């Protein structure tokens, strides 16, 4: 029925992400686990859970890393959704440029190897920075001639998790299930649109602080972790729920409206944007307009788009330099 | 409504366990997280997930570990369920006896510290070996005079997950939701009762191999992890699901029949046994008979009880030596 592959399944994010998918994947699904170390152990661990009708496959790549790993090529056969989660997490000790360089090459190799075997699969990019790794994946897809603009999804959902949580904490018992977050998935590019959710809002004073908190929430966790790591459990929650939305859409079990960092297909001047889409059996089914926003929200989006464009260009420049 | 504390929440097991509890705890619950390192980060991580009506508390103990940590004493206030999941990994250079001694002393300290503040809480023992750490907890409860035989629960459910999974793999598409597992929670003490599940069974040759695999499934994962770790994801699944059974019973939301390593009251010559109980508003509500079993299952259980008695005596001997 559906075969979902977690590429990078043995890291801190991948393990919890894989656990969530194992518990929620519909009966008859297959969970495929790839990592360059620790994949057999994660698979054995998860295979012991009493899911009925779930098959757990795995493959171990060569350490130290080999490009176009033959083991990944085998695993990628028949996969419908690739969750690209491999690469380094945003932990202290690597700049936002260092993270980009090693992770860009990792995303390139993995997407290249996976799409060469399963070119009609969906690709959910959670490897950071998704503002740049998503266009890098697109360029990789373009290079081998299998790019489908409706099957590449940069996972921006964690922003929505935080934006929803923070506003719900502010006006409890008034609770909403989601908050639109558009633009990008980096501090300067994250734009929550609280004006679009029902109910009275806090003063604009408090609102400014909550918006800022959404944008620097990743740093908030690194600080709370005394610099010993970054968000992994909430990261896994966002990656799984979004993968689930894609899976249910592929199966015709839902046509969900989600916010993701996607190819804009000419609907916005920016080539890629965190924006509302509805998913169907072919991936992105409809690109929706962002909707009415406040002047202050428009100002945030204008500055966000400015650096999103530079994020994209950086990723595309790296990609063409390596082909 | 309910306040569930995960004691050891920053370990591999604790983090995924806490993640599942955050996703599953009913609206209005409180999730409390304690660890000697990393508790603030795990709390910040989980706090960003868009659960409505869930409060996330944490407390950071001293490191190096100090007895009766006052930070734990504060967080223990008002807790209904303690998940003791604070076992230390066995590092190269430690004897198997050394491992038992630090884990037994850890269970003793944390039960002592928590029960002194919240003596009517339920205690779910996940720290291994539960065949011995559960009687150690009981002896600790008895010394401070707050022992409730119905609220001390050794978590043996992972045996049931593997026993259910392996038999479902054997007879698919014939699927059962659970398999009775009695006796203990280690190697020779684990006794699956496949004779009690519906449907035809494999021939006794295949059955012997499946039971053996349940008994040594823990090392199956250690092997698949090249000795660098043990089952954490499936351990977290079992811990969270049993904690959830206890939580729903403390509320008026279920009276579930579960299998757990518990004080047998007067029902068995063995003081502690993995056996069927039904949980209610006061913890264990009914102790149920193990039921009819095969001559082979009877023989396995006889060998198991023999070592469970030794396991108990070992734990109680350690407990008496430290008060």
CA distance A257 to chain B (A): 17
Name the token pair of A293: 């926003």
Name the token pair of B169: 């793999």
A175:B229 CB<8 A = no
- Residue found by looking up tokens 């009251």 in the block: B265
B234:A45 CB<8 A = yes
C-alpha distances (whole Å) from B247 to each of A285, B82, B239, B251, B273 are 42, 11, 12, 6, 22
Name the token pair of B151: 């609220």
Specify whether the backbone of B17 is left (phi greater than 0), alpha (psi in -120 to 50) or beta. Answer: alpha
Give Cα B289 distance to the centre of its chain: 21
Give the list of residues 6+ apart from residue B202 with CB closer than 8 angstroms, or none.
B170, B171, B210
- CB of B16 within 8 Å of a chain A CB? The answer is yes
Give the list of residues 6+ apart from residue A78 with CB closer than 8 angstroms, or none.
A3, A118
Kindly give the pairing relationship between strand B81-84 and strand B3-7: parallel
Q: Note the resolution in Å, 1 decimal.
A: 2.6
Residue A257 burial by Cβ neighbours in a 10 Å radius (0-12, 13-18, 19+): middle
Name the token pair of B273: 């046994």
Inter-residue contact B217 to B321 (CB < 8 Å) = no
Radius of gyration in angstroms for the set of CA atoms belonging to chain B, rounded to a whole number: 19
What residue ranges in A50-100 does DSSP mark as E strands? 55-60, 81-84
- Other C-beta atoms closer than 10 Å to the C-beta of B216 total 13
Inter-residue contact A45 to B232 (CB < 8 Å) = yes
Q: Is the dihedral angle over the CA atoms A28, A49, B293, B267 positive or is it negative?
A: negative
Q: How far apart are CA B122 and CA B120, in angstroms?
A: 7
Residue A288: phi and psi, rounded to 5, are -100, 150
CA distance A268 to chain B (A): 29
Residue B152: phi and psi, rounded to 5, are -110, 120
Name the token pair of A91: 């932990």
Q: How far apart are CA A12 and CA A88, in angstroms?
A: 10
* Helix, strand, coil percent values for chain B (each to nearest 5): 45, 15, 35
A172:B52 CB<8 A = yes
| Biggest distance spanned by C-alpha atoms of chain A | 57
- CB of B236 within 8 Å of a chain A CB? The answer is yes
Q: How far apart are CA B292 and CA B289, in angstroms?
A: 9
Give the list of residues 6+ apart from residue A74 with CB closer than 8 angstroms, or none.
A59
- CB of B90 within 8 Å of a chain A CB? The answer is no
Domain boundary assignment for chain B: 1-155, 156-323
* Contacts made by residues B287-293, CB under 8 angstroms, sequence distance 24+: B287/B262, B288/B257, B290/B180, B290/B182, B290/B193, B291/B180, B291/B193, B291/B196, B292/B195, B292/B196, B293/B193, B293/B195, B293/B196
Give the list of residues 6+ apart from residue A106 with CB closer than 8 angstroms, or none.
A86, A87, A127
Kindly give the pairing relationship between strand A3-7 and strand A30-35: parallel
Q: How far apart are CA A290 and CA A183, in angstroms?
A: 10
Give Cα A302 distance to the centre of its chain: 23
Inter-residue contact A307 to A189 (CB < 8 Å) = yes
Give Cα A20 distance to the centre of its chain: 15
Give Cα B44 distance to the centre of its chain: 25
For residue B21, the chain A residues in CB contact (below 8 A) are none
- CB of B63 within 8 Å of a chain A CB? The answer is no
DSSP string for residues in B36-91: SSSHHHHHHHHHTS--SS-EEEEEE--SS--SS-HHHHHHTTT-SEEEE--PPP--
């Amino acid at each position: 029925m559906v075969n979902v592959a977690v590429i990078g399944a043995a890291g801190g994010i991948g393990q919890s992400l894989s656990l969530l998918l194992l518990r929620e994947l519909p009966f008859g699904s297959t969970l495929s686990l790839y990592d360059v170390v620790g994949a057999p152990g994660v698979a054995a661990d998860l295979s012991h859970i009493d899911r009925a009708g779930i098959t757990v496959k795995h493959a171990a790549g060569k350490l130290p890393p080999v490009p176009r790993d033959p083991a990944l090529t085998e695993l990628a056969e028949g996969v419908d959704v690739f969750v690209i989660v491999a690469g380094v997490p945003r932990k202290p000790g690597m700049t936002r440029d260092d993270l980009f360089n090693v992770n860009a090459g990792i995303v390139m190799d993995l997407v290249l190897t996976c799409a060469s075997v399963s070119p009609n699969a969906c690709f959910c990019i959670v490897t950071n920075p998704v503002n740049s790794t998503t266009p890098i994946a697109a360029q990789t897809l373009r290079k081998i001639g299998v790019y489908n603009k409706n099957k590449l999804l940069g996972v921006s959902l964690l922003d929505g998790l935080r934006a929803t949580r923070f506003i719900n904490n502010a006006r409890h018992p008034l609770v909403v299930p989601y908050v639109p977050v558009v633009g990008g998935h980096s501090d300067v590019t994250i734009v929550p649109l609280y004006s679009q959710i029902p109910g009275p809002l806090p003063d604009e004073s408090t609102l400014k602080e909550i918006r800022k908190r959404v944008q620097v929430a990743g740093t908030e966790v690194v600080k709370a972790k005394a610099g010993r790591g970054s968000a992994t459990l909430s990261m896994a929650e966002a990656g799984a729920r979004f993968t689930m939305h894609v899976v249910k859409a592929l199966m015709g079990l839902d046509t969900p409206m989600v916010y993701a960092y996607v190819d804009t297909d000419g609907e916005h001047e920016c080539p890629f944007l965190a924006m509302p889409v509805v998913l169907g059996k072919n991936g992105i089914e409809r690109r929706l307009p962002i909707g009415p926003i406040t002047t202050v929200e428009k100002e945030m989006l204008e500055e966000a788009v400015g650096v999103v464009k530079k994020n994209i260009a950086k990723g595309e420049t790296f990609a063409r330099s390596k082909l």
